[PDB]
Amino acid sequence: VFQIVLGAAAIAGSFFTAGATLAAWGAAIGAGGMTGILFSLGASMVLGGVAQMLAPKARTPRIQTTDNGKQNTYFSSLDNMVAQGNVLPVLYGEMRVGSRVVSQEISTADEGDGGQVVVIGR
Amino acid sequence: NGKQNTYFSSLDNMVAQGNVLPVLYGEMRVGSRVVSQEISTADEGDGGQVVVIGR
Amino acid sequence: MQDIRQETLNECTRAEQSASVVLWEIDLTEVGGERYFFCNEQNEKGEPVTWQGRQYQPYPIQGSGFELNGKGTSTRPTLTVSNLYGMVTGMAEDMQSLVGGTVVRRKVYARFLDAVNFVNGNSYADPEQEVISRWRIEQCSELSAVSASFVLSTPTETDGAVFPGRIMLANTCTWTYRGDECGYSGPAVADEYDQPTSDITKDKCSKCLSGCKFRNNVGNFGGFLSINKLSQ
Amino acid sequence: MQDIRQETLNECTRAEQSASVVLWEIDLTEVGGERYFFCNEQNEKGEPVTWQGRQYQPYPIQGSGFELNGKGTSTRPTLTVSNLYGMVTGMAEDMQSLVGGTVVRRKVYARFLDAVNFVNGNSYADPEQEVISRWRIEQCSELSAVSASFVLSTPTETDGAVFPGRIMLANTCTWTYRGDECGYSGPAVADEYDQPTSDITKDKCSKCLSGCKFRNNVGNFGGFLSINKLSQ
Amino acid sequence: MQDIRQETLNECTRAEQSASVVLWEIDLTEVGGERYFFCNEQNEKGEPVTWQGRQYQPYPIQGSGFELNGKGTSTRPTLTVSNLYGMVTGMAEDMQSLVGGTVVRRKVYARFLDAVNFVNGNSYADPEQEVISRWRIEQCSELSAVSASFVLSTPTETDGAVFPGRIMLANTCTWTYRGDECGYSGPAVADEYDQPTSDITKDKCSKCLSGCKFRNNVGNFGGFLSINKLSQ
Amino acid sequence: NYNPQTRQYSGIWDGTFKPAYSNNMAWCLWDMLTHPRYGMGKRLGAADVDKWALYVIGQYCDQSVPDGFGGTEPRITCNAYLTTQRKAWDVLSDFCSA
Amino acid sequence: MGKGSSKGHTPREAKDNLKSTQLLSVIDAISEGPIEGPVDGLKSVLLNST
Amino acid sequence: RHNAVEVNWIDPNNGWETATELVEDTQAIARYGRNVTKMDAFGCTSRGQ
Amino acid sequence: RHNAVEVNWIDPNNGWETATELVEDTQAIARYGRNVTKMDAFGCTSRGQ
Amino acid sequence: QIGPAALKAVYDMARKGARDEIQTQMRDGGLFS
Amino acid sequence: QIGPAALKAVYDMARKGARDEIQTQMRDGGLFS
Amino acid sequence: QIGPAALKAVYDMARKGARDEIQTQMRDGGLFS
Ligand code: SF4
Ligand code: SF4
Numbered sequence A: 001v002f003q004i005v006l007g008a009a010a011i012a013g014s015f016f017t018a019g020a021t022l023a024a025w026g027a028a029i030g031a032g033g034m035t036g037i038l039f040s041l042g043a044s045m046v047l048g049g050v051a052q053m054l055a056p057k058a059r060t061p062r063i064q065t066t067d068n069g070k071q072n073t074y075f076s077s078l079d080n081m082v083a084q085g086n087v088l089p090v091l092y093g094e095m096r097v098g099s100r101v102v103s104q105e106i107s108t109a110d111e112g113d114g115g116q117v118v119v120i121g122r
Numbered sequence B: 001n002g003k004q005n006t007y008f009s010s011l012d013n014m015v016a017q018g019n020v021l022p023v024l025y026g027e028m029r030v031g032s033r034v035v036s037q038e039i040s041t042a043d044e045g046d047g048g049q050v051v052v053i054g055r
Numbered sequence C, D, E: 001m002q003d004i005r006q007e008t009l010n011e012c013t014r015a016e017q018s019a020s021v022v023l024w025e026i027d028l029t030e031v032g033g034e035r036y037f038f039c040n041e042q043n044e045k046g047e048p049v050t051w052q053g054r055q056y057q058p059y060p061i062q063g064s065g066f067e068l069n070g071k072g073t074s075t076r077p078t079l080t081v082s083n084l085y086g087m088v089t090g091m092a093e094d095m096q097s098l099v100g101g102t103v104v105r106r107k108v109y110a111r112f113l114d115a116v117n118f119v120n121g122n123s124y125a126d127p128e129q130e131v132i133s134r135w136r137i138e139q140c141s142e143l144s145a146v147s148a149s150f151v152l153s154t155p156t157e158t159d160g161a162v163f164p165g166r167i168m169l170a171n172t173c174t175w176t177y178r179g180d181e182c183g184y185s186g187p188a189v190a191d192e193y194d195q196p197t198s199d200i201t202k203d204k205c206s207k208c209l210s211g212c213k214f215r216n217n218v219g220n221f222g223g224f225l226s227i228n229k230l231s232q
Numbered sequence F: 001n002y003n004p005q006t007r008q009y010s011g012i013w014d015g016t017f018k019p020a021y022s023n024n025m026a027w028c029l030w031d032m033l034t035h036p037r038y039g040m041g042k043r044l045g046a047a048d049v050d051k052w053a054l055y056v057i058g059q060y061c062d063q064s065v066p067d068g069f070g071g072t073e074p075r076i077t078c079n080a081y082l083t084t085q086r087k088a089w090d091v092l093s094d095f096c097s098a
Numbered sequence G: 001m002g003k004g005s006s007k008g009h010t011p012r013e014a015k016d017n018l019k020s021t022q023l024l025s026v027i028d029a030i031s032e033g034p035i036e037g038p039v040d041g042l043k044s045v046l047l048n049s050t
Numbered sequence H, I: 001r002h003n004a005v006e007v008n009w010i011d012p013n014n015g016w017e018t019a020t021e022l023v024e025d026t027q028a029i030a031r032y033g034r035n036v037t038k039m040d041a042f043g044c045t046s047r048g049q
Numbered sequence J, K, L: 001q002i003g004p005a006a007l008k009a010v011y012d013m014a015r016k017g018a019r020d021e022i023q024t025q026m027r028d029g030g031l032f033s
């Protein structure tokens, strides 16, 4: 006959569960055609805020005491990080970036770059 | 390494941007939040009249 | 123990006692409204219950979840009221859902009620016999064509607060305009967009350095105008 | 709003409407199976329900938990089916418990069904009146001698995925053999154990440097053959 | 499989079997108490049930939540006993609420019980037919004027333990006085406040360096008397 | 029909993407969702993501708004540099909250 | 100065009296897939912060 | 009902570091106390965004 | 039903550092998408383990 | 009250109560669920 | 049993069960709720 | 129905619902329980 559809005054004290008296529904325990205990999502969806139901509220990295008070983000890096088992970064437009060092070698530079004439001492 | 920090002290000169202003409640030896730090050339002569540069 | 009068303690131990009447007061004066007084019942003369000379208008109202526990979450009572004839609705659209208001609850033994409530009078009438509790409205949890439920909270409720709160910023003042820390008392200068104005009702600070300079208040600027380069 | 035809919208607002039939399709072609079409009911002639010329066979089937919510957890519907006569069991042992298949659900008003379904025909028969929703099988939650329950999920379901996914490794290729980035199209060379083979069905890459050298594909090796020493 | 005798296995498969009695033993000997034996029933002669020659006294006792699961939380059974006549209360005020004791549960088929239990005797009496489980008392969850509920736990229950446990400290010994690592066996020297005493019942190390010097045991001192300056 | 340098659209789209560098965050999200190599292209795939909704979203993000310094500025823009490996839901939620 | 490859090569200063020259050969991995490239050119390569 | 927000963007002018921008609504601060939050602007490199 | 695993062991040959070993099953990747996890091998100092 | 229909109602009420308790524990003292 | 009064009891028993389950999951294996 | 056994059954159903809700919130959006 009815659909109860419990709200918030009903769950917070049985003051208005008997307001609708739940008589014919309880006498019929419900039905296979229709379901009770709908539990309207009004106040549950709004607990974090109205702006949470329109945007997913992007997260921020944990604050690390290693940095004195410097704030890091999740979308930039100005460091030459280790490149072993670390995923290759994605860059989306502009940005000044660090890198994942793949090779770093120190050797002796060989005099002479191109062409023919090479002079060592001047 | 194995150093233990607490929630009620700091002996560091931390970065002072978007980092709130600390509160000190009695005694304690403290670090700071550096507001300005510039290196320049000191100008000889502090006060008074007579200034001697070379001795 | 609570500081309650000896008469109430005497009545509490009696085997056969009078009915305990709970009187409610909604105080929206701090949020720009008025004060409303409610009782769940009328008196024996079909009139609103008179307590301490003040009438508490009859209205279906019931509170639940009142407790004093220090451990764990702060207690959040609930207050259910009738929304027939669209009365609470009228408050929700005028007082921003009543949020931020105060709710005062008094427990009074009916034997101490004012003599006007009873046909034969009250010889033991005593206006000083009451137990008072104050709470704040946190959220109108539900509002329908039948009723309205409000969540109450203790006035302290250190939920969203942080400590210390003052934040170190550059190019932005954290003080309140014309406040104590800002310490400005001059005439109208400009609005929040730095455009000059002689209108006092349109005088606001942009909270930038230029806004402070417009008022010659750079000494009291709430920002720190060097930290933007040391944080690199 | 959903893009549904005007006839369905006209039918939805009528006081007295026709029965809303729900037709199910299980598509396991992407996982190496067939397509099975089901309906919870027969028709008035005791035959499988004919919709758009396709016969949907009678079988006890019932879905629940269907909703469109963006906030919070992605919706996971459920589909209960009859496991009498061990039919679904036979599907579970042949298709790895149906995991990875597709479930297509069509809502159709019975007034728009094909005329063959009714003895007196259907003058308003319209094969273009349906509401279609696609989901994926995630887990056969229960399989018993009586029934079988399947968990459904949206095809996107960003649950176990990470971003970015490509990993920086030495001594191991992250590409897919004979794939796009691997870019190999030569003959059979060796198996995953580097043992030479001329058998195309046993030709796999060990994903090590030696396996790449076997195919002269070191230029397209997916690893970084210096990072092992810099990470110390 | 559990190592249980063939007679019990033969009885388990019978269509019509004897009643399975559960005999309980509370062992507080390791916590300074005695051993009590209980059974929920008397025998056919109105006497405490005799098993293996030991009398288990009649007392309302019932256990629940017994299971063997490795995945997840360690299983915590419960044991409800009668607190009429305040007997358990008497144990709670003498044994620190029985905490730390042992509970032994024996499952025995009534057919194997001692012949003294039955008027006509027991031909199949076998004192070696039992299934034994051991648990420990973790908390007397409820104690009232009617009943008493005890939480049980496995003896291992690695709940509050840490590994490694020995902590590196200065100015304090982590060893146990007169223990194996402390290795002290001399006469009484002083108390825990370093005040000298010749009383053996008042001899306790202060765990500081002075307390160790009092015993000339600085070689076996459990602290590291330099780390306080390197940790700056 | 989109010119990333001028951030202008010619007429009706019809589909048929084109490989041009752009700062439009709707299409950065599209690449994050439908890239087979490093993104979620193996799972999911195209025809499961509404490209027209992202088209309208990118049109909205390309609108010019006051800069606050005196000029104009595109409404919403990219320039993120994602280096750490986070769950796909995290990156999707950051994109959909930006 | 090109898409998909570049050469840069600011020249080395001539030495005075023989001497060796230490060389630092690094390779840095950035982003995935076809990227547009440097914003300007060789002015977009910072060696320490310059 | 938050009336004060600290948005963490990244400045490309001073240096590519995290700059905090404070947004307020002083009218609502006179009605609903002062509810302050922190938030990370995902793609922001312009103070206006 | 995971098909790709990154095991973090410790190499005693290059240097006593965390080396990542990628184990895959390409046949299952053609059936159940590609489910990847990470895992630490506790006592492992040999690639085989 | 027939058991088969009442069990689903009890299960749904239990789910709602669990969600409410979880959201309550994310408050200040609580347990943070 | 009248439904209106029984629903509150079921809800509160659900709350108690949820709290007990949460406290149970904060144990060693559990789930840490 | 008799109150004791009904209350016990409601308690176990509430525990099951709480466990299911906890395991549900550990998914992507959820609350991470
Ligand atoms: S900027 Fe200056 S005038 Fe404006 S609020 Fe701050 S201190 Fe007052
Ligand atoms: S190692 Fe070489 S041949 Fe083997 S999959 Fe990788 S790129 Fe292809």
Ligand code: SF4
Binding pocket: E173, E174, E175, E176, E177, E178, E181, E182, E183, E184, E205, E206, E207, E208, E211, E212, E215, E217, E218, E220, E221, E222
């Ligand atoms: S301080 Fe010395 S005597 Fe005292 S407990 Fe430790 S080792 Fe034993």
